[PDB]
Design a protein around this ligand. Structure first.
Ligand SMILES: Nc1ncnc2c1ncn2[C@@H]1O[C@H](COP(=O)(O)OP(=O)(O)O)[C@@H](O)[C@H]1O
Ligand SMILES: [Mg+2]
Ligand SMILES: [Zn+2]
Lengths: 202, 49
Protein backbone atom coordinates (compact mmCIF):
# COMPACT_ATOMS: atom_id res chain seq x y z
CA UNK A 1 0.00 0.00 0.00
CA UNK A 2 1.35 3.39 -0.99
CA UNK A 3 -0.15 6.77 -0.36
CA UNK A 4 -0.04 10.24 -1.82
CA UNK A 5 3.02 12.32 -1.12
CA UNK A 6 2.61 15.39 1.04
CA UNK A 7 3.41 17.87 -1.74
CA UNK A 8 0.60 16.47 -3.90
CA UNK A 9 -2.22 17.02 -1.42
CA UNK A 10 -5.01 19.48 -2.26
CA UNK A 11 -6.61 21.68 0.37
CA UNK A 12 -8.66 20.03 3.08
CA UNK A 13 -7.86 16.53 1.91
CA UNK A 14 -6.50 13.28 3.33
CA UNK A 15 -3.80 11.54 1.27
CA UNK A 16 -5.18 9.00 -1.16
CA UNK A 17 -3.87 5.47 -0.86
CA UNK A 18 -3.75 2.91 -3.62
CA UNK A 19 -2.39 -0.62 -3.44
CA UNK A 20 0.26 -1.52 -6.00
CA UNK A 21 1.01 -5.05 -7.11
CA UNK A 22 4.64 -6.03 -7.40
CA UNK A 23 5.56 -9.07 -9.44
CA UNK A 24 8.33 -11.49 -10.01
CA UNK A 25 11.53 -9.49 -9.55
CA UNK A 26 10.16 -6.15 -8.33
CA UNK A 27 8.69 -8.04 -5.49
CA UNK A 28 10.60 -6.80 -2.45
CA UNK A 29 11.58 -3.40 -3.78
CA UNK A 30 9.52 -0.96 -1.71
CA UNK A 31 9.82 -0.84 2.06
CA UNK A 32 7.46 0.87 4.44
CA UNK A 33 8.25 4.55 4.65
CA UNK A 34 10.15 4.65 1.36
CA UNK A 35 9.57 7.37 -1.20
CA UNK A 36 9.38 5.33 -4.37
CA UNK A 37 8.57 5.73 -8.04
CA UNK A 38 6.34 3.02 -9.48
CA UNK A 39 6.24 2.45 -13.22
CA UNK A 40 3.53 0.19 -14.51
CA UNK A 41 -0.15 0.34 -15.34
CA UNK A 42 -3.29 1.31 -13.52
CA UNK A 43 -5.66 -1.65 -13.67
CA UNK A 44 -9.11 -2.47 -12.36
CA UNK A 45 -9.60 -5.47 -10.09
CA UNK A 46 -13.12 -6.84 -9.54
CA UNK A 47 -13.94 -6.22 -5.89
CA UNK A 48 -16.87 -7.72 -4.00
CA UNK A 49 -18.60 -4.83 -2.22
CA UNK A 50 -22.15 -3.40 -2.59
CA UNK A 51 -25.25 -2.27 -0.67
CA UNK A 52 -24.80 1.26 -1.84
CA UNK A 53 -27.57 0.20 -4.21
CA UNK A 54 -27.99 -2.42 -6.91
CA UNK A 55 -25.57 -1.22 -9.57
CA UNK A 56 -24.13 -2.23 -12.93
CA UNK A 57 -24.44 -5.92 -13.62
CA UNK A 58 -23.66 -8.52 -16.25
CA UNK A 59 -26.04 -11.18 -17.51
CA UNK A 60 -26.38 -13.47 -20.49
CA UNK A 61 -27.78 -12.07 -23.69
CA UNK A 62 -29.54 -15.36 -24.40
CA UNK A 63 -33.28 -14.96 -23.99
CA UNK A 64 -34.19 -17.79 -21.66
CA UNK A 65 -37.37 -17.85 -19.61
CA UNK A 66 -38.07 -20.36 -16.88
CA UNK A 67 -41.05 -22.69 -17.15
CA UNK A 68 -43.87 -22.98 -14.63
CA UNK A 69 -42.37 -24.19 -11.40
CA UNK A 70 -38.98 -22.93 -12.55
CA UNK A 71 -39.74 -19.27 -13.10
CA UNK A 72 -36.54 -17.30 -13.57
CA UNK A 73 -37.25 -15.03 -10.63
CA UNK A 74 -35.54 -14.46 -7.33
CA UNK A 75 -32.23 -16.07 -6.54
CA UNK A 76 -32.92 -18.95 -8.92
CA UNK A 77 -33.57 -16.43 -11.67
CA UNK A 78 -30.42 -14.47 -10.96
CA UNK A 79 -28.41 -17.69 -10.90
CA UNK A 80 -29.95 -18.91 -14.15
CA UNK A 81 -29.23 -15.68 -16.02
CA UNK A 82 -25.64 -15.56 -14.78
CA UNK A 83 -26.18 -12.23 -13.10
CA UNK A 84 -23.19 -10.71 -11.34
CA UNK A 85 -22.24 -7.28 -10.10
CA UNK A 86 -19.77 -5.29 -12.17
CA UNK A 87 -18.01 -3.61 -9.28
CA UNK A 88 -14.37 -2.64 -9.63
CA UNK A 89 -11.56 -0.89 -7.85
CA UNK A 90 -8.41 0.73 -9.15
CA UNK A 91 -5.06 -0.93 -8.48
CA UNK A 92 -1.58 -0.14 -9.74
CA UNK A 93 0.33 -3.01 -11.33
CA UNK A 94 4.00 -2.04 -11.16
CA UNK A 95 6.58 -3.55 -13.48
CA UNK A 96 9.38 -1.51 -11.89
CA UNK A 97 10.10 0.29 -8.62
CA UNK A 98 12.75 2.96 -8.14
CA UNK A 99 13.49 5.37 -5.31
CA UNK A 100 12.01 8.78 -6.03
CA UNK A 101 15.17 10.62 -4.95
CA UNK A 102 18.10 8.24 -5.42
CA UNK A 103 20.99 8.56 -3.00
CA UNK A 104 23.78 7.50 -5.35
CA UNK A 105 23.24 7.93 -9.05
CA UNK A 106 25.11 4.77 -9.91
CA UNK A 107 23.20 1.64 -8.90
CA UNK A 108 21.30 0.30 -5.91
CA UNK A 109 21.43 -3.38 -4.94
CA UNK A 110 24.69 -6.23 2.43
CA UNK A 111 25.77 -2.60 2.86
CA UNK A 112 29.47 -2.56 3.57
CA UNK A 113 31.65 0.51 3.17
CA UNK A 114 32.98 -0.77 -0.14
CA UNK A 115 29.46 -1.62 -1.32
CA UNK A 116 28.38 1.96 -0.65
CA UNK A 117 31.46 3.35 -2.39
CA UNK A 118 30.92 1.10 -5.43
CA UNK A 119 27.27 2.16 -5.45
CA UNK A 120 28.37 5.74 -6.18
CA UNK A 121 29.54 7.42 -9.36
CA UNK A 122 33.06 8.73 -9.83
CA UNK A 123 32.23 12.36 -9.10
CA UNK A 124 30.14 11.39 -6.08
CA UNK A 125 33.03 9.56 -4.49
CA UNK A 126 35.35 12.38 -5.47
CA UNK A 127 33.15 14.60 -3.30
CA UNK A 128 32.86 12.06 -0.48
CA UNK A 129 36.63 11.62 -0.34
CA UNK A 130 37.13 15.37 -0.61
CA UNK A 131 34.97 16.16 2.40
CA UNK A 132 36.44 13.25 4.35
CA UNK A 133 39.84 14.91 3.88
CA UNK A 134 38.29 18.28 4.74
CA UNK A 135 39.95 19.81 7.74
CA UNK A 136 37.27 21.89 9.47
CA UNK A 137 34.63 19.46 8.20
CA UNK A 138 32.87 19.55 11.56
CA UNK A 139 32.17 23.27 11.32
CA UNK A 140 31.33 23.00 7.63
CA UNK A 141 28.73 20.31 8.28
CA UNK A 142 27.23 22.30 11.14
CA UNK A 143 26.93 25.39 8.95
CA UNK A 144 25.64 23.60 5.86
CA UNK A 145 23.07 21.61 7.82
CA UNK A 146 21.56 24.56 9.73
CA UNK A 147 22.13 27.67 7.61
CA UNK A 148 19.15 29.70 8.76
CA UNK A 149 19.81 29.21 12.49
CA UNK A 150 21.92 31.76 14.32
CA UNK A 151 23.99 30.72 17.28
CA UNK A 152 23.19 27.53 19.16
CA UNK A 153 26.42 26.03 17.90
CA UNK A 154 26.51 23.32 20.55
CA UNK A 155 23.04 22.13 19.58
CA UNK A 156 24.12 21.97 15.94
CA UNK A 157 27.20 19.97 16.87
CA UNK A 158 25.28 17.55 19.06
CA UNK A 159 22.56 16.98 16.49
CA UNK A 160 25.27 16.33 13.91
CA UNK A 161 26.95 13.75 16.13
CA UNK A 162 23.55 12.16 16.64
CA UNK A 163 23.23 11.91 12.88
CA UNK A 164 26.53 10.07 12.74
CA UNK A 165 26.02 7.91 15.83
CA UNK A 166 28.27 5.51 17.69
CA UNK A 167 29.01 1.82 17.30
CA UNK A 168 26.55 -0.80 18.58
CA UNK A 169 28.08 -3.76 20.37
CA UNK A 170 27.10 -7.10 21.85
CA UNK A 171 28.58 -8.42 25.07
CA UNK A 172 29.58 -12.05 25.44
CA UNK A 173 26.91 -12.44 28.12
CA UNK A 174 24.41 -11.19 25.53
CA UNK A 175 24.15 -7.61 26.79
CA UNK A 176 23.47 -5.17 23.96
CA UNK A 177 25.34 -1.87 24.12
CA UNK A 178 23.52 1.14 22.68
CA UNK A 179 25.49 2.66 19.85
CA UNK A 180 23.53 5.73 18.85
CA UNK A 181 23.03 8.87 20.80
CA UNK A 182 19.81 10.54 21.84
CA UNK A 183 19.51 14.31 22.21
CA UNK A 184 16.85 16.36 23.98
CA UNK A 185 16.56 20.11 23.49
CA UNK A 186 14.98 21.97 26.39
CA UNK A 187 14.33 25.64 26.01
CA UNK A 188 12.28 28.75 26.40
CA UNK A 189 9.70 29.56 23.72
CA UNK A 190 10.81 30.39 20.20
CA UNK A 191 14.44 29.34 20.64
CA UNK A 192 14.18 27.13 17.54
CA UNK A 193 13.83 23.65 19.02
CA UNK A 194 11.11 22.77 16.54
CA UNK A 195 13.33 24.20 13.82
CA UNK A 196 16.20 21.86 14.67
CA UNK A 197 13.79 18.95 14.63
CA UNK A 198 12.33 20.06 11.28
CA UNK A 199 15.80 20.51 9.79
CA UNK A 200 16.75 16.97 10.76
CA UNK A 201 13.45 15.54 9.54
CA UNK A 202 13.72 17.13 6.12
CA UNK B 1 -46.71 -30.00 -42.73
CA UNK B 2 -47.23 -33.08 -44.88
CA UNK B 3 -50.22 -34.29 -46.86
CA UNK B 4 -50.44 -38.04 -47.37
CA UNK B 5 -53.21 -40.40 -48.50
CA UNK B 6 -54.07 -43.76 -47.04
CA UNK B 7 -56.61 -46.15 -45.63
CA UNK B 8 -57.36 -46.26 -41.93
CA UNK B 9 -57.15 -49.74 -40.46
CA UNK B 10 -57.46 -49.05 -36.73
CA UNK B 11 -59.05 -46.33 -34.63
CA UNK B 12 -58.44 -46.31 -30.89
CA UNK B 13 -61.05 -45.41 -28.31
CA UNK B 14 -61.28 -41.69 -27.71
CA UNK B 15 -59.47 -40.85 -24.48
CA UNK B 16 -58.62 -37.79 -22.41
CA UNK B 17 -55.38 -35.89 -22.77
CA UNK B 18 -54.78 -32.80 -20.69
CA UNK B 19 -54.13 -29.46 -22.34
CA UNK B 20 -53.71 -27.66 -19.02
CA UNK B 21 -52.87 -29.29 -15.70
CA UNK B 22 -52.70 -28.07 -12.14
CA UNK B 23 -50.38 -29.57 -9.55
CA UNK B 24 -50.51 -29.23 -5.78
CA UNK B 25 -47.70 -29.45 -3.26
CA UNK B 26 -48.02 -32.27 -0.76
CA UNK B 27 -46.96 -30.24 2.28
CA UNK B 28 -47.99 -26.60 1.84
CA UNK B 29 -50.95 -27.48 -0.39
CA UNK B 30 -50.24 -24.58 -2.74
CA UNK B 31 -51.12 -25.09 -6.38
CA UNK B 32 -49.26 -24.46 -9.62
CA UNK B 33 -52.27 -24.10 -11.91
CA UNK B 34 -52.81 -23.91 -15.68
CA UNK B 35 -49.53 -25.42 -16.80
CA UNK B 36 -49.78 -25.70 -20.56
CA UNK B 37 -49.23 -29.14 -22.03
CA UNK B 38 -47.53 -29.68 -25.35
CA UNK B 39 -49.89 -31.04 -28.01
CA UNK B 40 -49.27 -34.43 -29.54
CA UNK B 41 -47.47 -37.44 -28.15
CA UNK B 42 -45.36 -35.37 -25.78
CA UNK B 43 -45.18 -35.74 -22.01
CA UNK B 44 -44.49 -33.47 -19.07
CA UNK B 45 -41.97 -33.65 -16.25
CA UNK B 46 -43.30 -32.21 -13.02
CA UNK B 47 -41.27 -29.57 -11.20
CA UNK B 48 -39.01 -31.14 -8.60
CA UNK B 49 -39.32 -28.26 -6.14
N1 LIG C 1 19.02 31.56 16.50
C1 LIG C 1 17.70 31.61 16.75
N2 LIG C 1 17.20 31.71 17.99
C2 LIG C 1 15.88 31.76 18.23
N3 LIG C 1 14.95 31.72 17.28
C3 LIG C 1 15.31 31.62 16.00
C4 LIG C 1 16.73 31.56 15.65
N4 LIG C 1 16.83 31.47 14.33
C5 LIG C 1 15.56 31.47 13.86
N5 LIG C 1 14.66 31.55 14.86
C6 LIG C 1 13.20 31.58 14.64
O1 LIG C 1 12.40 31.46 15.81
C7 LIG C 1 11.14 30.93 15.40
C8 LIG C 1 10.51 30.04 16.46
O2 LIG C 1 11.11 28.76 16.34
P1 LIG C 1 10.37 27.43 16.82
O3 LIG C 1 11.35 26.32 16.79
O4 LIG C 1 9.13 27.30 16.01
O5 LIG C 1 9.96 27.71 18.34
P2 LIG C 1 10.17 26.69 19.55
O6 LIG C 1 11.63 26.73 19.80
O7 LIG C 1 9.32 27.29 20.62
O8 LIG C 1 9.64 25.38 19.06
C9 LIG C 1 11.42 30.08 14.18
O9 LIG C 1 10.60 30.49 13.10
C10 LIG C 1 12.86 30.35 13.83
O10 LIG C 1 13.00 30.62 12.44
MG1 LIG D 1 8.03 23.94 19.28
ZN1 LIG E 1 -45.04 -26.51 -0.97
Amino acid sequence: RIQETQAELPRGSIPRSLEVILRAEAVESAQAGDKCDFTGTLIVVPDVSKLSTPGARAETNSRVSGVDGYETEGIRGLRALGVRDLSYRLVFLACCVAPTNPRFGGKELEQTAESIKNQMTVKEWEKVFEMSQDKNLYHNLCTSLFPTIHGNDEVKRGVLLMLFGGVPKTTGEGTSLRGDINVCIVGDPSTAKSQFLKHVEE
Amino acid sequence: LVKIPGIIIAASAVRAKATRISIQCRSCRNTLTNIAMRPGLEGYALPRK
